[PDB]
Amino acid sequence: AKKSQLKKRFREFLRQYRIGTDRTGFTFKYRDELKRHYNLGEYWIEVEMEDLASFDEDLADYLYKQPTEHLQLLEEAAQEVADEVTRPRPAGEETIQEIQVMLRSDANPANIRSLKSEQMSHLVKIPGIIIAATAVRAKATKISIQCRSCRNTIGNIAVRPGLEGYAMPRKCNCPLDPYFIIPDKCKCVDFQTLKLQESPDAVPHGELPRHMQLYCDRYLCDKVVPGNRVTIMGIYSIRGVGIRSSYIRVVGIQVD
Amino acid sequence: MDASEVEFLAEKEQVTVIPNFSLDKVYLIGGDLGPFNPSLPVEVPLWLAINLKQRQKCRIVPPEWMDVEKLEAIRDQERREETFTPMPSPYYMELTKLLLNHAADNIPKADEIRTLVKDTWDTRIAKLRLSADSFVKGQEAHAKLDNLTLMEINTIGTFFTESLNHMYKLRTSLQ
Amino acid sequence: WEPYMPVEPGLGREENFLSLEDLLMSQEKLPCCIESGFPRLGFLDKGGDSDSIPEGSKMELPLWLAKGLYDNKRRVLSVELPKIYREGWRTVFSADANVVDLHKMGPHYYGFGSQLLNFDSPENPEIAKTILQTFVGRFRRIMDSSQNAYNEDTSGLVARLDELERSLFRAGQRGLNAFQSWERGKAAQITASNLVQNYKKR
Amino acid sequence: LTPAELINKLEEAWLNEKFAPELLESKSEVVECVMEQLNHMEQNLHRAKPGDLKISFHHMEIERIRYMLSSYLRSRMLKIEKFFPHILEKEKSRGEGEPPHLSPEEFAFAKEYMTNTETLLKSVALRHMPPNLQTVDLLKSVPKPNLDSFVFLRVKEEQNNILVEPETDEQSEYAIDMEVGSQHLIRYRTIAPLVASGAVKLI
Amino acid sequence: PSALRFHMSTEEMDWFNQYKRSLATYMRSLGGEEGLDITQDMKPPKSLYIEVRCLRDYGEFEIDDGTTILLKKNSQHFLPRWKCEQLIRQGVLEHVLS
Amino acid sequence: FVSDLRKEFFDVIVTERVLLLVAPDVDALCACKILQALFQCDHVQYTLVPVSGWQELETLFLEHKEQFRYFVLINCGANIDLLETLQPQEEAIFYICDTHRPIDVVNIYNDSQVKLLIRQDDDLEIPAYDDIFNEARRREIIFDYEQYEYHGTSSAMMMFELAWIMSKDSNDMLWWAIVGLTDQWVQDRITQMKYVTDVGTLQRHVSRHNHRNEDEENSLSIDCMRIAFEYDLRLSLYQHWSLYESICNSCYTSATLKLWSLQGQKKLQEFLADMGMPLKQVKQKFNSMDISLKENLREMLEESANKFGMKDVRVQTFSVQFGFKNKFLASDIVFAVLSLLENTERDEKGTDNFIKALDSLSRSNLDKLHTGLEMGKKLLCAIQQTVASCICTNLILSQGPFLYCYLMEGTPDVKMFSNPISLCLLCKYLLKSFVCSTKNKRCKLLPLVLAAPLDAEKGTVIMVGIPPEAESSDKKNFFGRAFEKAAESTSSRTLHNHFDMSIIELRTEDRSKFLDALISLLS
Ligand SMILES: [Zn+2]
């Protein structure tokens, strides 16, 4: 499939990107950073967007327009590269941890009032000021279900990231809907929701500022407190007749 | 021992150059320099090769081990054995860095060579870290570090030895 | 090539006569009891009205004085262990050694703990074991923090480390920066020493 | 002995001196031979006609060897300065048949350094001290080499039945058979005679 | 320099002078004629001539040829390495790399 | 007049101590870089010292008149009699490689110290030796020979030729030669035909070096310099900031569309609409625009420019790509180096300004290059605002045959134009914009004389003048001679420190009489 080719291209980007000139020397930037972060205990990296464009313009162009699948492939590639760089791990740490990839770019920021409906499921960069936050709750990623009658088990079910659930099966494969989630067989991550307010100068005359709901996950939680000026990079998505609430899956924060 | 001194010990290996100037035999304190005939190979120490290339007076011939297939075989062998493995040269990292930085238009496929050497280096460094951790955890008094180059030792030295000294002092105090 | 080379402190039960750090470690006070009174020395105790310190009083004498006046006969002075080295804190250390703050517990933990072995006690075989196991348990995190930290503020990583561990952190950080500067081709510059630049700052 | 072997011996002495906790045996013969060769090569280079590339080659080689010699001598000087009293005391009780550890110039330098330190300390402080406390024994104040430090080594001549941690039976394996060309990590006290006899190289 | 000397005691100055004399005697004792100066050559050598740039005015610096060089700030000379290493280490010159 | 360079120039100074004197200009810096590369390759000692004006040149020669014998001068000291001013000795030999074509006659007819490296195959009308040196005919020849101050061939090209003869030529030297040629083009010191000929020559050299072959340039690693020929647009720094700002702040587009006026802005919006690019993408940074919009940008821009009266929107230039991300054009390097040379915030340590400008040209100081690029963007914006302000408020008065404009002290960004090159760039841009804007046919063929408050304390104003604009100008300027004659007639206090006689200083008090005398003389 094309997914394997895209994953291989992302792995090649991670393993082969270098910075510097032959007059001084060359240093691999993302492989070294991945090794250092994984050894330190922080499982994340900050991948710029101009670097990916310079390596492969098509790959960067597929991240500015279909961020979901391409970001998932990039995270899997980062996990594989991090696993191969630190292959002989000490006893007890054989299992490889999952890596979270954060994005950054130097583009001119947009406005909250400029977000049209055409730019849905696209990477956006909007500034603002945080005015609210919520308690750090839990969000599941891997779940296992079990039948109530015949106690059949279907494990390792994956749940999509963001404010999206998982429709449970009806047929038992034992009445209708016999499946319940096993409590202890669930892997969870951190989870927080913020509220971004339009900048005090971009607000037009004689009008109250507008707001926008944000979503933060894993290492992005507990990074911004109310009253901070931030620049947010995230995926515009949806959570009256046909009206749907829209939020922003945050994949990068630059506190000012 | 800083990395510059480890490079200083790696600037005495033998490499083949093809000069353009003409010169007769030179009697150096460490050996006899072969007759310099244009378009004729003459083996020289690595420092001389680097100086000649920087002064535009030669054309460095890549070493034998600097091939994609051989390096892939070495990398696959390294990622297979638990302990360290013999290397094509005792100064592979310094040789690779110097040759690929100072003469890359002569060496073909430099990028893949630099990408494979880095993988081998990363695997060996991870093995060394495991060795250090196991040494300290088990409170041992001896370790067999075979086939380990000087730069990889320099990476973690002056930290391993001092930690071991302090551990020994704290280990025999009641005696 | 480090120009200034001060005398290294001596780890274990023996100090160095010319070591400055060992000259400050012994200054730390240790609980003591005056087994035989010190006549004409009562002026040391401001609260005491008599000119002579009475027999049986308890004072927190410095470590050097306790070492000097100590005798196995225990007829001039007796030594009580500090709180950090008794069983209550030893069990906590045995629980997990990476969570404690060995900079507030004592700036010199290993050195003072080893110096405590000079005074005879029935708990020395346990104090030595506790110190050794603490070092063994805290080594790995120090190594990982020192090696894998490039161009980052290290004040957050050395805020819970005593002086020996801080020296090990400096060694690891200088062993990493040398290699990183070599790979980037900045190790081929003839540069002035840090002392010369610091003098120029003045 | 070809000059190349002399250079190799100089390099080995340099590396062995760098990693040793104590002051190793003097090698003044190699120093003198290298110095003589450099002195001759200076004039040999001076005579040559200007504009020749052989001038560059020989000058580079001379600069490449002088650094190694200077580094070796500097390491010896630093070790002498750090442990002058014990070194002098060992030199006083030197027995015939045992190789010397100090060249005569180094011995004179150590004497002068000790005299300077003693005179300065005496005049500055000891004169005004109480009469009872005016003698300081430098043999019990200046630190001593730590012969228990761990070192890296490469074996040249095979050695069998080497005892690791001879004073304790806690170690599971106490016997090590060193082969030829292998490298080990072990304390300096255990393998000091091997380094002294040239059977083991510290790298 | 006078700045460092101003903070030194007289006995310390005498000790410094005696140490300097002993060091010079040891240097001369090494080998024939003038001895090998251990203080110089403190880094592995890589090339004969190095590009340097002044950082302050230092009058004129003379070479063995009998000709001085006017050391003015922001000036560059392509001098040999063995004549400038001490000046670089003191802080009067700066090594310029390509 | 030196005919051979492998034997009469290099071999003479191989085993001596050279002293390089380099004038502050990008072409001179490129020539200096090539000369330094050759000297370091051949183990030749040298001393490099910055020289700014005639007085500094004389003082620096006096400082080192004894320590050195062989002297090399780049882009300075060729239009005047150096022997008379310096008073040298027989041993001293002066090698001169300067672009000024009105060479001094005395230096031309001399074999003692002045060995001119200037090529003899250039368009130079040498007067007869007997007529000058052997009487009214001599004065006639003098006036017919030194009338103008047109520049000549690039020094960097001569240095690259010298390196090529010795076979010690690399891509780094070819790039510096290209940068020198493009610097000459940007300052508008050479005609278009000469620029095209030089571009053809450098294209031949590039084709020689970059000998592309299958599996030889594919296995060839990245991070090796790869210069290529490109027929690119006429926009400034358009690959670093947004396309919109590049269009609004250039010289061809701003002048052609009259962007200083609102109707110009409307025409610009119509142009962008005709191209077919959203206003959002155009205002974003060039490195973040959509890929689809950048596919055939050159062709669509050329077509939509042709519709809107813009013809010469494509020029011939070169590029360079030494690695994954680094990629520049010659004009970008020219602007960055020029900005680093002339800085007002870094007015302190002017010698350090020269040092930074020289260091920025090496592939190991890219950060200084990026700061130079930012400073160039700011300079372009400032000159555009100043030109718009001058044109809109009608501060240009046709005082006789020549136009006169004076910058007020309170005018923003006036300290930037105290520097010579910035003042010249402002003068050319303002003249072109005014010619495009005005409707008077007579006024379209008139010169411009701009001024600026050089120093407030001493009441000195810097003055400059450029030849009248024409479709195919000869780049010949007579303003230096006229300025000198008017200064003598009025007994004015003027200084000619700069190597270009067209730029002189002048007191505030002597301004009016000097201007009136110049009007009378040019009448
Ligand atoms: Zn069921």
Layout of helices and strands:
This is part of a larger assembly, with chains A (256 residues), B (175 residues), C (202 residues), D (203 residues), E (98 residues) and F (523 residues).
Chain A (H helix, E strand, L loop, with lengths): L1 H15 L1 E2 L7 E2 L1 H11 L3 E5 H7 L1 H5 L5 H19 L14 E5 L18 E11 L3 E11 L5 E6 L20 E19 L13 E7 L11 E10 L7 E10 L1
Parallel strand pairs in A: 3-4, 9-11
Antiparallel strand pairs in A: 1-2, 5-8, 5-10, 6-7, 6-8, 8-9, 10-11
Helix pairs in contact in A: 1-5, 2-5
Chain C lengths: L19 H6 L3 E5 L24 E5 H7 L8 E2 L7 H9 L13 H7 L8 H24 L15 H21 L10 H8 L1
Antiparallel strand pairs in C: 1-2, 1-3
Helix pairs in contact in C: 5-6
Chain D lengths: L2 H16 L9 H20 L5 H30 L1 H9 L11 H21 L25 E6 L3 E5 L11 E4 L4 E5 L4 H5 L3 E2 L2
Antiparallel strand pairs in D: 1-4, 1-5, 2-3
The complex binds zinc ion (ZN).
Q: What global shape of chain D is seen?
A: flat
Main beta-sheet annotation of chain F = 5 strands, parallel
Helix fraction of chain D, binned, reads 40-55%
Largest sheet of chain D: 3 strands, antiparallel
Number of strands of chain F: 12
N-to-C SSE series of chain D? Answer: HHHHHEEEEHE
First and last CA, distance of chain D: 23 Å
Q: Tell me the total number of β-strands of chain D.
A: 5
Name the structural class of chain D: mainly alpha
Share of helical residues of chain F: 40-55%
The total count of helices of chain F amounts to 20
Q: What gross morphology of chain F would you assign?
A: globular
Strand content of chain D: 5-15%
Distance between the termini of chain F: 38 Å
Radius of gyration of chain F: 24 Å
Strand order of the largest sheet of chain F: 2-1-3-4-5
Question: Structural class from helices and strands of chain F?
Answer: alpha/beta
Structure annotation, total helices of chain D: 6
| Spatial arrangement of strands, main beta sheet of chain D | 4-1-5
